[PDB]
């Protein structure tokens, strides 16, 4: 009567007779408020821990029915021509946003965009409701001119709508098209006028919060991730535990010590963290002896997290990958159909792998100079969230023993360096 | 060079010459504003969670101070012999607070009382200094008389400052005692004066929050949890899945399927349920068989959560208790004489477990009507938090085969039931 889905493991009745609510996120702000930023950021987190979700830029929109950008003369409240160009742009963001929650399998829709008067968020309000989406509004309010400036200077002044300018000039052009907003302007309010919607108000860069109304689960974790999120500078270290014994061996798991490679790697990352001379630098390992071995070659104090273990592989724990073939060969072949979703029997997936995650990421999100020394599919996990890598790339990453990948957030994404060690040990990737 | 802990299993480094930052929590609100409820259920989270944690509510100290209580006339401002027992009070509950979080090993204080004005801050704020306490205020703003008049009928007139006290006399007393308060209040601000306060203002009953400032891990995990409990009325069921053939042969772990009294089990489970007759039962199942096929019974939606699984056994799983002692004496042994820190090898502990249930937890506390299905050593750490239950105690609760347990939370803690539903089964338990 019940019967055990074979990729999955998921126990599910028998069927003999197989023959016969969405969000939308509204962003609102004046310009340069982070908007963009948060939109792509929260998106990130959403696709990453399964929840299907798509930005709606209204702008991408503008530069796609407007060749050039003039100048802020286009964003001038006076200039009939360009409201006309701007609202039909919004209405056709609007209407793929309806195609995607409704018809394209998409679970929230981030509108991003200014929406700042109440005209045009009634308007946005209205259309939610029309489809029966959800509605929560993220305002981004900020009031400290160094802070505008700075954010100009980082992500405006180099984007495409600045091509042939130097700073000073695309600076000028944009705190005028700030002031178009600046007249019309109605914040949210949660005392008054809008006592009745979902929203969040980060303030100050992300360290007030007023936040009304949270509708239900999803909105709950979109609330706790926002609330969490700094854009303090950091880097993020992220690598494997030294070479390990099972390594040499091609076994899978288990809680085997380092190799004598893997000791060197450890001496190699103590001097390579030594001379990245850092402050306050907070080092995470497993709970797996290999990770808590290498940290021990870098005399600093360590966490270890149980969630960073390796993937487990239940019945295949301590086994070769022929062992696992000649032994399990349906299993086998499963997981190479479907590496993502797939459960070793008794263990885990990489789904799996992404859920024991989620306070790890969490907790990064929190934390500003990291280094974390893991195991290959975790590593592949993180990695993933942090380069929006979707979950069909994410157990195909290569993330090589004796190599740390070096993170710097930047705005709207993540550069990534790699840093070889000069220390031999073998290869554990496995192509499709 | 690193030995694994026998108990806990963790890899340490070995130590051949073994020879040779807290928190208080300030409560801020007029009475009946809900936060001795608050400070008591936060304060049985972060115990749950493993964070030592303790209530120091001035009232207590007062009543022990004072004998009988005779009004409301105690509380007037211009009461000069009143006012300073009341300081001597405060100042009592704060010295056994620097005791507590300096010297007897606690990491969060909840320092529970008005504290309705700016004087009282500062010397609580100068207070925290002094010690090197890092200092979080929650204020409960509550606007609402129909919420106030309900909060005093509820948890007021039956305290022991009204013994000798019909109704409406004790909720005469009691809105006339609230106007002492009333006056001098000057709520927090973090606008313009408490600008560098952290805080969170609960608004609405928990529907609308001002955060400022949170500064570290466990602030925003108690802003996260404050954030999503309600106190809409609700019944929370817990029971193990019907009876399974493992249960028979005293077999621990694996992922058995019912034997036929747990199909009978089921059938009254279904039964039960019907005739509670529910407003929007929320059903969860662990992804282990037995507790599937006891949810397919009830004919209702149901979900299943991998971190409801019972405790896992690591090498030990689908093994007798008497295996086990022939098999891994010394393991045995230790998990005997620790068994909320024991973990089995490759496995769990109990301790492992609590951290796993932090998602359903925080999820129970978002729903209202939920009925959970799942394993012996899962129901002991669900109940040992709703309990109020430590950690010496949580693996030792009776969680017995066929019985509901019906809690409903009432204020300041939780009623249980036990329903058994007259299907005979083995059992499962037993004493240290
Ligand atoms: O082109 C852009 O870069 C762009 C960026 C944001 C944006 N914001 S919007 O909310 O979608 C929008 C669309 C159309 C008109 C307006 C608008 C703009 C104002 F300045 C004042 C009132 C308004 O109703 C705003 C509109 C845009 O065209
Ligand atoms: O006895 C009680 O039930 C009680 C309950 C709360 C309480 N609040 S308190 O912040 O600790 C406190 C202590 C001493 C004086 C005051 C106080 C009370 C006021 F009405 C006005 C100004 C004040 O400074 C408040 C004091 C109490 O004595
Ligand atoms: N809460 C915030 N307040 C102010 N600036 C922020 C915030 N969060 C991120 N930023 C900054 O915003 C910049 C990105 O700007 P962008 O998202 O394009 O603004 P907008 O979309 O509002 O025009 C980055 O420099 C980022 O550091
Ligand atoms: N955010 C809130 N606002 C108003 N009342 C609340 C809130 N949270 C809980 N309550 C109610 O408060 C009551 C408990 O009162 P109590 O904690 O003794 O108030 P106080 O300690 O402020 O005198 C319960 O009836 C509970 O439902
Ligand atoms: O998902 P894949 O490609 O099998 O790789 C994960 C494996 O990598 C390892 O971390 C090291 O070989 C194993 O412990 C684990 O099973
Ligand atoms: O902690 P204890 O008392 O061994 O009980 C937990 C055990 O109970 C069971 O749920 C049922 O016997 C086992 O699966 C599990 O090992």
């Given at each position: 009567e019940l019967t055990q889905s074979r990729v999955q493991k998921i126990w599910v009745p028998v069927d003999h007779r197989p023959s016969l609510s969405p969000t939308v996120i509204v962003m609102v702000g004046l310009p340069?408020?982070?908007?963009?930023?948060?939109?792509?950021?929260?998106?990130?987190?959403?696709?990453?821990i399964g929840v299907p979700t798509k930005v709606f830029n209204v702008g991408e929109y503008r530069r796609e029915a407007v060749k050039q950008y003039s100048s802020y003369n286009f964003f001038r409240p006076d200039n009939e021509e360009a409201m006309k160009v701007r609202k039909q742009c919004a209405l056709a963001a609007l209407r793929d946003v309806k195609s995607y929650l409704a018809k394209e399998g998409g679970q929230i829709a981030v509108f991003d965009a200014t929406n700042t008067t109440r005209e045009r968020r009634h308007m946005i309000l209205h259309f939610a409701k029309e489809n029966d989406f959800k509605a929560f509004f993220i305002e981004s309010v900020c009031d400290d001119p160094t802070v505008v400036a700075s954010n100009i200077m980082e992500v405006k002044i180099s984007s495409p709508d600045y091509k042939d300018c130097n700073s000073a000039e695309a600076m000028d052009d944009f705190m005028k098209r700030i002031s178009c907003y600046e007249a019309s302007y109605q914040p949210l309010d949660p005392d008054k006028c809008d006592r009745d919607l979902s929203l969040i108000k980060v303030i100050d860069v992300g360290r007030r919060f007023l936040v009304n109304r949270v509708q239900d689960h999803i909105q709950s974790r979109i609330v706790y991730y926002l609330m969490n999120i700094h854009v303090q500078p950091r880097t993020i270290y992220l690598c494997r535990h030294g070479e390990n014994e099972h390594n040499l061996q091609g076994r899978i798991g288990g809680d085997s010590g380092l190799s004598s490679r893997g000791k060197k790697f450890a001496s190699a990352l103590s001097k390579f963290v030594e001379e990245?001379?850092?402050?306050?630098?907070?080092?995470?390992?497993?709970?797996?002896?290999?990770?808590?071995?290498?940290?021990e070659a870098l005399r600093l104090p360590y966490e270890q997290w149980k969630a960073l273990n390796e993937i487990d592989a239940g019945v295949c724990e301590e086994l070769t990958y022929e062992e696992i073939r000649d032994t399990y060969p349906e299993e086998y072949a499963l997981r190479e159909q479907d590496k993502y979703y797939y459960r070793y029997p008794t263990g885990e997936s990489y789904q799996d792998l992404v859920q024991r995650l989620e306070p790890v990421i969490m907790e990064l999100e929190r934390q500003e100079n990291v280094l974390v020394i893991c195991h290959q599919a975790v590593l592949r996990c993180l990695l993933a969230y942090f380069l929006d890598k979707s979950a069909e790339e994410m157990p195909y990453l290569k993330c090589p023993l004796h190599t740390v990948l070096k993170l710097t957030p930047v705005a709207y994404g993540c550069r990534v360096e790699s840093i070889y060690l000069n220390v031999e040990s073998v290869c554990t990737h496995r192509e499709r």
């Open positions: 340069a408020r982070g908007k963009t930023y948060i939109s792509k950021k929260l998106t990130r987190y959403l696709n990453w990245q001379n850092l402050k306050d630098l907070r080092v995470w390992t497993s709970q797996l002896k290999s990770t808590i071995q290498t940290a």
